[PDB]
Amino acid sequence: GPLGSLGRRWGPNVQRLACIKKHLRSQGITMDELPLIGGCELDLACFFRLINEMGGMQQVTDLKKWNKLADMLRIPKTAQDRLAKLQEAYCQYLLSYDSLSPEEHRRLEKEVLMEKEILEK
């Protein structure tokens, strides 16, 4: 097929979503199928970047503005649980992972990063 340009780095968005996924499952959270929020699909890479762009997680959560950051993430406003589900969804995901020490980062990252780099040979 025309697709299949594997071999080197898959990209930052892929590396981020991969690292979080590996940790989530290894932490007791099975996310092999697909993550969902507010009845819709969400990209950990896109979500992670969004929070960081909001002056860090502290701002997003403390200043109570998940509505805006999430809005850009493409979430249904009709969901009366997307707001609360999101708060707990990130607090139990992004928070936990983001709390990981340099070891869990290098270990989990080095594993995935190499898995893709040396995927060829």
Kindly report the CATH class assigned to 1-121.
Answer: mainly alpha
H-assigned helices in 54-93: 57-62, 66-72, 82-91
Give the 3-state secondary structure of residue 118: coil
The experimental technique used to determine this model is NMR
Whether the CB-CB separation of 11 and 96 falls below 8 Å is answered with no
Return all residues near 48 (Cβ < 8 A) that are at least 6 apart.
Answer: 16, 20, 94
Domain boundaries, the chain: 1-121
Give the 3-state secondary structure of residue 40: strand
Cα–Cα distance measured from residue 95 to residue 109, given in angstroms and rounded to the nearest whole number: 17
